[PDB]
Design a protein around this ligand. Sequence first.
Ligand SMILES: CCS(=O)(=O)NCc1ccc2c(c1)OCO2
Length: 182
Amino acid sequence: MGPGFDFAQAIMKKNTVIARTEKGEFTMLGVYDRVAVIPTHASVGEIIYINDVETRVLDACALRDLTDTNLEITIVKLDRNQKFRDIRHFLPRCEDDYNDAVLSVHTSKFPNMYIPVGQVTNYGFLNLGGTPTHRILMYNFPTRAGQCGGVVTTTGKVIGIHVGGNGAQGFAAMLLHSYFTD
Ligand SMILES: CCS(=O)(=O)NCc1ccc2c(c1)OCO2
């Protein structure tokens, strides 16, 4: 409808796949080469389904900060025959607050879904499903089961992936440029 949705659509159309694990279907953001991200609670194993194709996992790393606190991001390297468009230059370098964000989801259950979530707070610490978690972004939208892995964007920036909610608020794990240096 406007330039926020324009940027979100551009990311969804080229840089997302549908990931299936034993824990469900997730929106999965491809970042560069064969490297993607998913919420750690997806419990990635040795094999994952990518757009319903059986795919070997070459590496999977559940990220934690230097206090050894959960970040709820898993970085996955996929044995896939095709590279993602490199979008690392759209990742923020530092922790921040944002205005006018969009949460975008693409699954069998929620195809081509775009939610204007509005203002995003650098919330920080969250007890997420009983797990102490850092670098959480919060938005005041009643997000629901099926949105985990959804991409949080502003115009020109890919800032997080949706990891939970409390019925009234939704929570995303930050994406930082420093996670994907090589
Ligand atoms: C807190 C429940 S939820 O429905 O908001 N999000 C799914 C979820 C489930 C288990 C988790 C988790 C997130 O992060 C750590 O363990």
